Amino acid sequence: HSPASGRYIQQMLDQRCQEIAAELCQSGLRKMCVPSSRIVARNAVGITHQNTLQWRCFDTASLLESNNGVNCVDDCGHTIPCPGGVHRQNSNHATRHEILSKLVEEGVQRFCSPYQASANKYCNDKFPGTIARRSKGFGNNVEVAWRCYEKASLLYSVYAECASNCGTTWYCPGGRRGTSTELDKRHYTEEEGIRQAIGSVDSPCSEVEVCLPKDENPPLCLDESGQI
Ligand SMILES: CC(=O)N[C@@H]1[C@@H](O[C@@H]2O[C@H](CO)[C@H](O)[C@H](O[C@]3(C(=O)O)C[C@H](O)[C@@H](NC(C)=O)[C@H]([C@H](O)[C@H](O)CO)O3)[C@H]2F)[C@H](O)[C@@H](CO)O[C@H]1O
Ligand SMILES: [Cl-]
């Protein structure tokens, strides 16, 4: 078991989209009659005129290899660029923004570390749209620091440090490579503010318990060992 996000919200959205595609197939929508491996949930634009980011059930065979990028979701419910792009003319998808958004809201309660939630809130309050990671900055692929990152600048396939539900080291999808692209500039380093945000969270365990973090809330609170 790795100290890493299970990406449980994204897993649930993909499974719900697989059911929805199957239902649409049964209603006669031929292009949706596919194996489950062909269907994922992504947050993205759609075809021409569908210009807002919405949750949609995509046929992967209709996605482009690049980036109209598509976004996946972390276990605190933030949308982050994933591999691929929407074909604005040829996309095969079903927009299902309400059911999928509701599943994200439910998942956040289950899976989002209150320590990470506090860090994210700090960042969004100060720089709207940003989330917290301890990751790379511009043109340096070694140094990490707590920063508020514009979500568009993160890569879902790259794991970066985040706060566990014990306020300890964890890793989450949505990270930086430390490359030198314009996107690599889109962050605000906030070591003191983010650390204070994380430190301000009340423990789920008592002062007489040891917090062992888990990929779902609550963490394990084990009775502290005695002076045996
Ligand atoms: C704002 C500024 O110029 N402050 C001077 C200090 O420079 C800042 O030092 C921090 C170190 O914590 C960063 O190196 C920093 O760079 C970044 C960042 O936060 O990582 C680089 C980002 O690309 C940029 N974001 C953009 C362009 O979208 C941010 C952003 O400009 C900034 O966070 C806004 O507050 O900055 C860097 F700017 C400097 O170290 C001290 C003393 O020398 O003086 C400050 O005034
Ligand atoms: Cl996560």
Describe this structure in words.
The chain has 228 residues and is of the alpha+beta class. It has 2 domains: 8-112, Actin, Chain A, domain 4 (Alpha-Beta Complex), CATH 3.90.640.70; 113-224, Actin, Chain A, domain 4 (Alpha-Beta Complex), CATH 3.90.640.70. It is built from 4 helices and 12 strands. It has helices spanning 8-26, 97-111, 114-126, 191-199, and strands at residues 39-44, 54-59, 69-73, 79-85, 93-95, 130-137, 140-150, 155-163, 169-175, 187-189, 209-212, 220-223. The strands form 5 sheets. A 3-stranded antiparallel β-sheet has the order 1-2-5. A 3-stranded antiparallel β-sheet has the order 6-7-10, with helices on one face. A two-stranded antiparallel sheet has the order 3-4. A hairpin with a 2-residue loop joins strand 6 (130-137) and strand 7. The longest helix has 19 residues, at 8-26. The protein is globular, with a radius of gyration of 19 Å. Bound molecules: a molecule of 3 linked components (NAG-2FG-SIA) and chloride ion. A molecule of 3 linked components (NAG-2FG-SIA) binds next to strand 10. Residues 93-95, 185-189 are annotated as: Interaction with host sialylated oligosaccharide chains. Residues 206-225 are annotated as: Beta-finger region that is required for the interaction with and correct trafficking of MIC4. It comes from Toxoplasma gondii.
